[PDB]
Design a protein around this motif. Structure first.
Motif, short mmCIF file in Angstrom:
data_model
loop_
_atom_site.label_atom_id
_atom_site.label_comp_id
_atom_site.label_asym_id
_atom_site.label_seq_id
_atom_site.Cartn_x
_atom_site.Cartn_y
_atom_site.Cartn_z
N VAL A 1 0.83 -1.20 0.00
CA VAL A 1 0.00 0.00 0.00
C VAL A 1 0.86 1.25 0.00
CG1 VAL A 1 -2.03 -1.04 1.04
CG2 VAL A 1 -0.18 -0.19 2.49
N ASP B 1 -6.72 5.61 4.33
CA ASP B 1 -7.35 6.17 3.14
C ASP B 1 -8.84 6.32 3.42
OD1 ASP B 1 -7.49 7.01 0.29
OD2 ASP B 1 -8.52 5.09 0.01
N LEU C 1 -9.97 3.01 5.24
CA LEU C 1 -9.15 1.85 4.92
C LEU C 1 -7.78 2.00 5.57
CD1 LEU C 1 -10.13 1.85 1.18
CD2 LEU C 1 -10.94 0.17 2.84
N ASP D 1 -4.38 0.23 5.97
CA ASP D 1 -3.58 -0.81 5.32
C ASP D 1 -4.44 -1.63 4.36
OD1 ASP D 1 -0.85 -1.81 5.15
OD2 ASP D 1 -1.61 -3.68 5.99
N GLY D 2 -5.38 -0.95 3.70
CA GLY D 2 -6.28 -1.58 2.76
C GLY D 2 -7.52 -2.19 3.37
N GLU D 3 -7.62 -2.26 4.69
CA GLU D 3 -8.72 -2.93 5.37
C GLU D 3 -9.67 -1.88 5.95
OE1 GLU D 3 -7.14 -5.90 7.93
OE2 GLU D 3 -9.01 -7.03 8.13
N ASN D 4 -10.97 -2.05 5.69
CA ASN D 4 -11.98 -1.09 6.14
C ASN D 4 -12.28 -1.30 7.62
OD1 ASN D 4 -13.82 1.03 5.87
ND2 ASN D 4 -15.51 -0.36 5.37
#
Ligand code: ADP
Ligand code: ADP
Ligand code: MG
Ligand code: MG
Ligand code: MG
Lengths: 99, 264, 264, 99
Positions: free
Chosen positions: C1, C6, C62, C64-67
């Motif tokens: 990432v 984010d 998000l 580390d890309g995880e919601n």
């Protein structure tokens, strides 16, 4: 040693001359005779005032306005530098106080 | 008098520890005076000494030539009316609007007529730019807007001395910039004497006519803003510039590092 | 990432009033990100959204890309271990010394051997310059010295993201300058991702790699420090420079002044 | 896709060569064999290490010190730039870590 305060006013024809200190402790005699002292007048002479506090300036604005209500535009003559500094602090427009 | 407040060899001690070692400090009347120093030095203490709520162990604190600790309770009560410690509690009545707050002092403690009193509050609300909020309540007031209304009510009676105790803390640069210009404006117009304690060094030195820096129970250096920011002194320069390491060490004295890493 | 956090079109509402109107914000990992704005905008709220203690009405956050809002309670509990919201409560155990505080995380949540753990705490105490205070207690710690020990214990487990909520408030320029250099040092060495909310605009922009300015439930402007301080925009320039009057008026809308002074 | 970590060490005459990642999850096998892996050695070669965390650097300092206690001064060869940045953060003197 001596620090006495007084406020006097003399109307000469069409001009009102204030002289002395224009502050909170001595302005009452003029406000009680406000309508009688300014209504033959079309120009206020702060030429001879040495001190003006916030309350005294408020009295001056009401004196200027009382003469405006009669219908004759009025001049402001001899205003001390510090008075204008006080007016600039209070953002006083050209209506209430001519420059 | 040339100095509204004049401290002369003032020492103050609490419990086991000494806070002030005969300090001597000056506040010239009509000018803005700034007090600076690390947290915990006694800045708030120094203000309460000027106010009379606490008395020094030794020295004299002359307000307008009169020594405050030696004053009668009747005299100290009256002399304190010429002072205003701002952003305290009380500040604003919570049950009346903004106009009534700023008008409340003159409504009682002055015998000015009513229509002139009304115009006077309107002008002073314009001074802090809150004339439109005259009918609002402190409930609705913003953060900075509330403190400007306190400033308006403070100068309502036009006291001789106003003291600000870290007035800029927790404020965004817009809110702070307003209060800096306001203080400087009321000083250059009404001639009110101001003592400002703060950590925001660049902002306070922009309006101060004289500044003081305290460290180690004593006064490190005083002088004007231009005189201070050109003063080449490590302990003065480290504080004014905010340098991590200097005469105030970044590192606590520790001893031998190699032994702490590799023992037995 | 590329971005550790984010936010994507995030809206948040409390009671009758809206705090965020689909905001979208970015925190690139390994770099220092600064959040700025007037008091009451929702800076602390925005941090608690990243942490998971509160969930947005709409959008996605998000890490580390995880919601985060959609995470399990078991997963959010574990993901939060990679985060550290600094200068909260807890921070330091009051019954053990400074060394034992910074060592406590590794003593349990890592299976590193003992002599290496001991050397690791000594090094991290040297990072914040408190190796000499290793046997002191939080009772004795100074104001700034205590917060440096909290920073040491925070980076003890080396989390991925650290969040500072107005860490400089009420601090003298020496104490502040230390904490600014410390944060910038730990970022350029350990690569820890930092989010810093502050009102001290010049200090935070000196170490930030990306900054954000918020006003009116939305993001006013973002960009780098050099890009922001050269941005000619009245509402951006008024905030960054701290000008009394601008798109944020100094004067409350009031109406006709002449009538307020002279009524009947 | 693949992010596996390992730590290896080979002693060639008087030089110990570490290769892999020198971090918290993989350093235990070396620390348990610390005294046996460094005591024929007089130079540690971090030439072939890609990652060094704070715990791994602490292991390196103890490895350097164990060889110092034998009585032979030791060289540090091939250290990555980021490792020296970490050492500068921790103010590591010339005793614990040669430059
Ligand atoms: N009642 C008290 N008993 C003992 N020590 C006190 C008491 N009040 C204050 N102190 C100490 O004296 C100092 C006074 O600091 P203060 O006046 O708050 O200065 P500042 O506002 O600059 O921090 C502080 O360091 C505090 O620890
Ligand atoms: N429980 C609540 N109920 C209603 N309004 C709230 C509540 N909590 C916070 N708010 C409002 O939402 C805003 C959140 O601000 P906050 O997160 O503290 O931002 P900052 O830290 O930047 O001031 C504040 O203006 C506050 O008035
Ligand atoms: Mg204080
Ligand atoms: Mg906050
Ligand atoms: Mg600042």
């Amino acid at each position: 040693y001596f620090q006495s305060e007084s406020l006097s006013w003399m109307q000469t024809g069409d001009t009102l001359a204030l002289s002395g200190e224009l502050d909170q402790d001595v302005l009452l005699p003029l406000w009680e005779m406000r309508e009688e002292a300014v209504k033959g007048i079309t120009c206020i002479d702060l030429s001879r005032v040495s001190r003006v506090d916030t309350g005294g300036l408020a009295l001056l604005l009401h004196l200027i306005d009382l003469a405006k209500k009669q219908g004759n535009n009025v001049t402001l003559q001899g205003v001390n530098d510090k008075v204008y500094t006080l007016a600039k602090l209070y953002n006083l427009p050209a209506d209430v106080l001519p420059r | 008098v040339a100095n509204l407040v004049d401290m002369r060899d003032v020492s103050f001690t609490r419990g086991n520890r000494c806070i002030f070692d005969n300090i001597s400090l000056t506040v010239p009347r009509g000018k803005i005076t700034a007090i600076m120093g690390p947290s915990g030095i006694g800045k708030t203490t120094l203000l309460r000494l000027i106010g009379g709520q606490i008395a020094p162990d030794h020295g004299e604190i002359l307000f307008d030539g009169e020594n405050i600790p030696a004053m009668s309770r009747s005299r100290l009560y009256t002399v304190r009316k010429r002072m205003s410690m701002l952003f305290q509690s009380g500040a604003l009545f919570t049950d009346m609007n903004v106009f009534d707050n700023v008008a409340y002092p003159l409504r009682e403690h002055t015998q000015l007529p009513a229509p002139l009193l009304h115009s006077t509050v309107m002008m002073k609300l314009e001074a802090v730019g809150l004339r439109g909020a005259a009918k609002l309540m402190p409930s609705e007031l913003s953060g900075g807007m509330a403190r400007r209304a306190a400033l308006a009510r403070a100068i309502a009676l036009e006291p001789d001395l106003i003291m600000f105790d870290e007035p800029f803390v927790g404020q965004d640069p817009i809110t702070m910039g307003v209060l800096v210009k306001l203080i400087s404006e009321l000083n250059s117009a009404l001639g009110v004497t101001c003592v400002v304690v703060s950590h925001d060094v660049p902002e306070v030195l922009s309006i101060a006519d004289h500044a003081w820096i305290l460290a180690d129970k004593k006064i490190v250096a005083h002088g004007s803003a231009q005189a201070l920011q050109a003063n080449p002194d490590p302990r003065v320069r480290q504080f004014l510039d905010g340098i991590a390491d200097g005469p105030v060490p970044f590192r606590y004295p520790a001893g031998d590092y190699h032994a702490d890493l590799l023992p037995g």
